[PDB]
Every structure is written in C-alpha cells, then in structure tokens.
Design a protein around this ligand. Structure first.
Ligand SMILES: [Co+2]
Length: 178
C-alpha cells in the first residue's frame, strides 16, 4: 500500500536493515511492484509503510526490466558536487503535485546490496536526482522542504487539499468536508 502526505510515518527516521535474507528480496520485490503499477520512477520503503532504509528505482520503467533496476540498502551520502541544479520533481506520495527543487548534480554514495556487501559509487544526472529524492525519504525529508519559495506557494491549495483527504480517515464525522 502506497502511502501519502501527510501520513506521519513519512516524517520518521527510517531504520537500518540488519537481516539481508529472502524476506528482504520479497519486500524489495513488492516495492518494485507498487512502483511499476503507480507510474512512478523511484520508490523508498517508508513510501509503502516500512520504516526501513531501502531505496529502489528504474530510469526507464516505461518498459519494466531486470537489472535495469537499481537497489540501495542502508545508503549514505559521502560527498556531493558544489555545482547545483533545479529540476522538476514529483513524488508518489504527492499525487499531481510538482515543483522545482535545488540539489547537487553529482553525489558520492556508499550503500549495501541485497546480500549485505558494501559498495562505493558515483551517481550523476538522473540517477543522482532520484537518489537524493529517495534518500531524503529515509531521513523524514520531503521534497516540499526543498522546494523553491515560488513553487511552494503555487502549490499550497493542492497540499492543503491532500490534508483534507487524509483527515477523512478518522472522518466518520461530517466536520471534514469535500
Ligand atoms: Co518521493
């Protein structure tokens, strides 16, 4: 189940994986599932209601494919370029909400694979973009924290819209409208 703003889980600090077993492969499996089915480019584990530090993505989910899939367990950003850029970013937790965000172009990361083994890699361009989006998710950061002042405003209606919907959870009482 794909979660949405402002579930308060999206704001909790995700925990390190410790057991790199089969269970995990399935959790990761189901993670990709939701992703492909929700027309989304990346996805992190809190985004499907799991407070664990997992990130996955696909540059070309237009045509879902093996090993075109990228997986990162317990990531860490160890250096970032000084060169920044703003691109339009979206989020499967904010449907129909889009804005420009400023992030470093390139990132030096460390992470652990599905099996437990550490890895050092340099991500640039799209991969860099998707990485920092999903990584923010693991620390309780949402891209509306980093959004420009202009786009943050230009999108308040929508954001507020989403808070309504969500309040229709403990809404068996009519004091929450539509
Ligand atoms: Co997101």
């Amino acid at each position: 189940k794909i979660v949405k703003y402002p579930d308060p889980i999206l704001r909790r600090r995700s925990e390190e994986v410790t057991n790199f077993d089969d269970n995990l492969k399935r959790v990761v499996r189901k993670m990709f599932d939701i992703m492909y089915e929700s027309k989304g480019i990346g996805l992190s584990a809190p985004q499907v209601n799991i407070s664990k530090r997992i990130i996955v993505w696909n540059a070309l989910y237009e045509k879902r494919k093996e090993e075109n899939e990228r997986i990162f367990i317990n990531p860490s950003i160890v250096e970032q370029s000084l060169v920044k850029l703003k691109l339009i970013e979206g989020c499967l937790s904010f449907p129909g909400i889009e804005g420009k965000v400023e992030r470093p172009s390139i990132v030096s990361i460390s992470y652990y694979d599905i099996n437990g083994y550490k890895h050092l890699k340099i991500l640039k361009g799209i991969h860099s973009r998707i990485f920092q989006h999903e990584f923010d998710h693991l620390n309780g950061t949402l891209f509306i924290d980093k959004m420009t002042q202009v786009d943050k405003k230009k999108v308040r209606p929508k954001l507020n819209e989403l808070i309504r919907d969500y309040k229709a959870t403990h809404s068996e009482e009519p004091l929450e409208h539509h």
